């Protein structure tokens with residue numbers, strides 16, 4: 206039994222069944238009454254550990270967490286670890302991507318490079334001194350208009366060159382095969398076996 | 399021109415890190431030379447403690463920083479001393495006091511139950527608040543001896559037998575240890591990450 210230490214349904218959709226396929230019994234932290242951890246970390250790695258640790262503390266189960274975000278080159282890597290609250294704590298996925306959009310409206314078509322980052326952590330117990338920490342990243346280009354209805358977050362404005370479409374235009378299987386998250390997950394599963 | 403602070407006060411670690419970082423092309427300065435005091439290690443993992451030490455140095459000096467958090471995990475002791483390796487014998491701890499304590503602790507542990515592993519995490523931070531530090535790790539299995547042997551290295555090396563070599567970590571040359579240790583492995587990964595960064 207392993208707790209999935211996220212409240213993000215888009216993350217759950219991209220993780221839970223692949224983890225199950227692998228052979229784990231996955232429980233969403235909300236089912237177990239785990240509230241949101243304080244994300245006080247300055248890096249994806251530290252925040253992923255904090256969220257996994259918070260869930261492992263509450264439940265006494267091993268935990269997997271995901272800290273991820275979008276880094277845009279012209280913005281010096283923003284919104285980065287502040288991706289979820291980019292437009293404030295009114296923030297929704299649509300409000301965040303539209304702010305990003307508005308922010309980049311005068312950025313030339315050839316300067317819109319970006320990269321998604323993902324750190325996945327597996328903690329055997331809350332105080333595991335050697336958690337499995339796996340990361341992935343995924344380069345793309347920020348579009349000027351959203352396209353596609355799949356995925357979540359900034360997916361409609363993230364053009365994926367290798368696919369010739371945005372992340373939201375991919376099927377879930379396609380996106381799982383190549384994303385920052387799918388790359389990290391492959392490394393995590395390798396490490397687990 | 400541009401310096402990188404080595405965020406450790408452990409001379410044994412400096413001896414094992416500085417020369418390859420210099421060969422790579424980094425201008426390395428030990429944090430003590432810049433007057434940096436030891437950070438408070440409040441982390442529960444090697445990775446968190448390596449990040450905190452790198453960040454403290456980076457903040458104090460305004461230079462990129464590399465830190466190492468490492469320790470010895472003994473199976474029969476449930477992984478102790480672990481992240482508490484440096485302070486194992488307490489507030490007066492020295493390498494010899496720490497290894498002798500561990501010795502004494504393991505006195506009645508049978509020969510087939512003395513397995514252990516060194517762990518190393520190295521971190522590189524461009525700035526104190528770098529959201530994506532380079533984080534590399536290495537581990538190295540061995541067996542705890544009953545008596546110290548060898549004078550090389552530092553820390554618990556005299557009591558860490560390495561089955562592949564048929565001698566303890568302290569009986570290895572500097573070159574032999576760097577080729578196979580938890581730290582040699584992590585450092586080459588870090589150099590690879592730095593180049594490809």
Ligand SMILES: O=P(O)(O)OP(=O)(O)OP(=O)(O)OC[C@H]1O[C@@H](n2cnc3c(O)ncnc32)[C@H](O)[C@@H]1O
Pocket residue numbers: 210211212213216244256271272273274275288289290298301321356357358359360372384386
């Ligand atoms: O902390 P948890 O509960 O896991 O949920 P969260 O959504 O608050 O998670 P983060 O702090 O890790 O927030 C990261 C964000 O990065 C964005 N993001 C992460 N992965 C994404 C993906 O695959 N596609 C689009 N956006 C993604 C996401 O929409 C948020 O803006």
Ligand SMILES: O=P(O)(O)OP(=O)(O)OP(=O)(O)OC[C@H]1O[C@@H](n2cnc3c(O)ncnc32)[C@H](O)[C@@H]1O
Pocket residue numbers: 405406407408411436439451466467468469470483484485493496516551552553554555567579581
């Ligand atoms: O924190 P810094 O300033 O780097 O110095 P420190 O010596 O306090 O560093 P740690 O908290 O990382 O302590 C780790 C320890 O693990 C031991 N250790 C680490 N690497 C070792 C090695 O290669 N051989 C023997 N012992 C080692 C070391 O002697 C300490 O007991």
Ligand SMILES: [Ca+2]
Pocket residue numbers: 244289
């Ligand atoms: Ca969050």
Ligand SMILES: [Ca+2]
Pocket residue numbers: 439484
């Ligand atoms: Ca220390």
Ligand code: NA
Pocket residue numbers: 288289297298299301302358359
């Ligand atoms: Na979002």
Ligand code: NA
Pocket residue numbers: 213215298357358
């Ligand atoms: Na989201």
Ligand code: NA
Pocket residue numbers: 468469480481482483484485
């Ligand atoms: Na220690």
Ligand code: NA
Pocket residue numbers: 408410493552553
């Ligand atoms: Na030492």
Ligand code: NA
Pocket residue numbers: 414575576577579580581582
């Ligand atoms: Na070494």
